[PDB]
Design an enzyme around this catalytic site. Structure first.
Site, PDB file in Angstrom:
ATOM      1  N   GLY A   1       0.797  -1.214   0.000  1.00 56.69           N
ATOM      2  CA  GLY A   1       0.000   0.000   0.000  1.00 56.69           C
ATOM      3  C   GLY A   1       0.831   1.267   0.000  1.00 56.69           C
TER       4      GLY A   1
ATOM      5  N   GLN B   1       2.413  10.288   1.517  1.00 56.89           N
ATOM      6  CA  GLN B   1       3.733   9.722   1.784  1.00 56.89           C
ATOM      7  C   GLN B   1       4.757  10.193   0.750  1.00 56.89           C
ATOM      8  OE1 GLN B   1       2.097   5.506   2.204  1.00 56.89           O
ATOM      9  NE2 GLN B   1       3.784   5.389   3.689  1.00 56.89           N
TER      10      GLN B   1
ATOM     11  N   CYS C   1       5.346   0.684   8.446  1.00 57.04           N
ATOM     12  CA  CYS C   1       5.027   1.781   7.540  1.00 57.04           C
ATOM     13  C   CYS C   1       6.291   2.238   6.815  1.00 57.04           C
ATOM     14  CB  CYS C   1       4.417   2.951   8.321  1.00 57.04           C
ATOM     15  SG  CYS C   1       3.697   4.287   7.309  1.00 57.04           S
ATOM     16  N   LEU C   2       6.164   2.531   5.525  1.00 56.88           N
ATOM     17  CA  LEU C   2       7.302   2.980   4.726  1.00 56.88           C
ATOM     18  C   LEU C   2       7.838   4.309   5.241  1.00 56.88           C
ATOM     19  CD1 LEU C   2       5.685   2.267   1.259  1.00 56.88           C
ATOM     20  CD2 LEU C   2       7.371   0.836   2.445  1.00 56.88           C
TER      21      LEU C   2
ATOM     22  N   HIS D   1      -5.342   1.228   6.486  1.00 57.34           N
ATOM     23  CA  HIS D   1      -4.043   1.833   6.784  1.00 57.34           C
ATOM     24  C   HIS D   1      -3.813   3.010   5.834  1.00 57.34           C
ATOM     25  CE1 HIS D   1       0.432   1.491   7.784  1.00 57.34           C
ATOM     26  NE2 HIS D   1       0.417   2.292   6.734  1.00 57.34           N
ATOM     27  N   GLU D   2      -4.089   2.800   4.552  1.00 52.64           N
ATOM     28  CA  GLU D   2      -3.892   3.865   3.578  1.00 52.64           C
ATOM     29  C   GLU D   2      -4.879   5.014   3.745  1.00 52.64           C
ATOM     30  OE1 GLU D   2      -1.140   3.729   2.244  1.00 52.64           O
ATOM     31  OE2 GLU D   2      -0.846   1.628   2.789  1.00 52.64           O
TER      32      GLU D   2
ATOM     33  N   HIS E   1      -3.727   7.405   6.201  1.00 48.03           N
ATOM     34  CA  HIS E   1      -2.717   8.341   5.727  1.00 48.03           C
ATOM     35  C   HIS E   1      -3.315   9.613   5.140  1.00 48.03           C
ATOM     36  CE1 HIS E   1       1.066   6.452   6.550  1.00 48.03           C
ATOM     37  NE2 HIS E   1       0.839   5.379   5.814  1.00 48.03           N
TER      38      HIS E   1
HETATM   39  C1  LIG Z   1       0.825  -5.804   6.100  1.00 46.23           C
HETATM   40  C2  LIG Z   1       0.366  -4.380   6.020  1.00 46.23           C
HETATM   41  C3  LIG Z   1      -0.697  -3.922   6.810  1.00 46.23           C
HETATM   42  C4  LIG Z   1      -1.091  -2.419   6.649  1.00 46.23           C
HETATM   43  C5  LIG Z   1      -0.359  -1.645   5.736  1.00 46.23           C
HETATM   44  C6  LIG Z   1       0.691  -2.248   5.006  1.00 46.23           C
HETATM   45  C7  LIG Z   1       1.509  -1.464   4.015  1.00 46.23           C
HETATM   46  C8  LIG Z   1       2.728  -0.764   4.644  1.00 46.23           C
HETATM   47  C9  LIG Z   1       3.385   0.271   3.713  1.00 46.23           C
HETATM   48  N1  LIG Z   1       2.942   1.621   4.065  1.00 46.23           N
HETATM   49  O1  LIG Z   1       3.639   2.336   5.034  1.00 46.23           O
HETATM   50  C10 LIG Z   1       1.864   2.158   3.445  1.00 46.23           C
HETATM   51  O2  LIG Z   1       1.415   3.276   3.669  1.00 46.23           O
HETATM   52  N2  LIG Z   1       1.034  -3.571   5.153  1.00 46.23           N
HETATM   53 NI    NI Z   2       1.972   3.564   5.881  1.00 45.83          NI
END
Ligand SMILES: Cc1cccc(CCCN(O)C=O)n1
Ligand code: NI
Length: 194
Positions: free
Chosen positions: A71, A76, A121-122, A164-165, A168
């Protein structure tokens, strides 16, 4: 202009385009995009999906030095627009693949859920243990590049990723949903996924 440089034909999104904690943008509520979309807004979504596919490719991920992911949200990349990309591989090829404009949760379950392995999270260069409490099921509305409306239902892993997205674009980080007192507390109605 972040969006102007990222959407240049020759530009490849890499870790250098992804901002980290502290940057005000990650805590700012992103602005809705209007329709019709500009070419740059369409290209940005495509670049974002390309990044995810690259990050999930062993060779490519290695060459570009990318962190694996399923995601990515425009904030970001320091672009305050309500645009997100999600790509979950089948464990046809992808269980879920979507570039979403103005995504919105229109319904959710009373039941909560959290990945047993926690979340990362990235934009977070550190590990934060704990169950990230989210809605178990969500119904999400969004528009595609053509301004077409979509209404989908998500559960399990996919539900978590999309939430999660969407967080953001609302200025929310995953650790915001981790119980301070006890990180691994299992409350009534909370489903742990593993
Ligand atoms: C396994 C998992 C659960 C929720 C979100 C993500 C993606 C992480 C990357 N990221 O920071 C996106 O914004 N991966
Ligand atoms: Ni994230």
């Amino acid at each position: 202009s972040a969006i102007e440089r990222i959407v240049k034909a020759a530009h490849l999104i890499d870790m250098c385009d992804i901002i980290r904690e502290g940057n005000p943008s990650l805590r700012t509520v992103a602005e809705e995009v209007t329709f019709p979309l500009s070419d740059q807004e369409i290209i940005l979504g495509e670049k974002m999906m390309q990044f995810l596919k690259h990050s999930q490719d062993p060779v490519m991920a290695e060459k570009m030095g990318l962190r694996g992911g399923v995601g990515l949200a425009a904030p970001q990349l320091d672009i305050s627009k309500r645009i997100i990309a999600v790509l979950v591989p089948n464990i046809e090829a992808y269980d879920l693949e979507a570039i979403m404009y103005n995504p919105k949760i229109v319904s959710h379950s009373v039941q909560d859920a959290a990945l047993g392995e926690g979340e990362g999270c990235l934009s977070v260069d550190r590990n934060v243990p704990g169950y990230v409490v989210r809605h178990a099921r969500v119904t999400v509305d969004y528009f595609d590049k053509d301004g077409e409306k979509h209404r989908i239902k998500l559960k399990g892993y996919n539900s978590i990723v999309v939430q999660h997205e969407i967080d953001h674009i609302n200025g929310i980080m995953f650790y915001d949903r981790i119980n301070e007192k006890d990180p691994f507390a299992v409350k009534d109605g909370l489903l742990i996924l593993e």
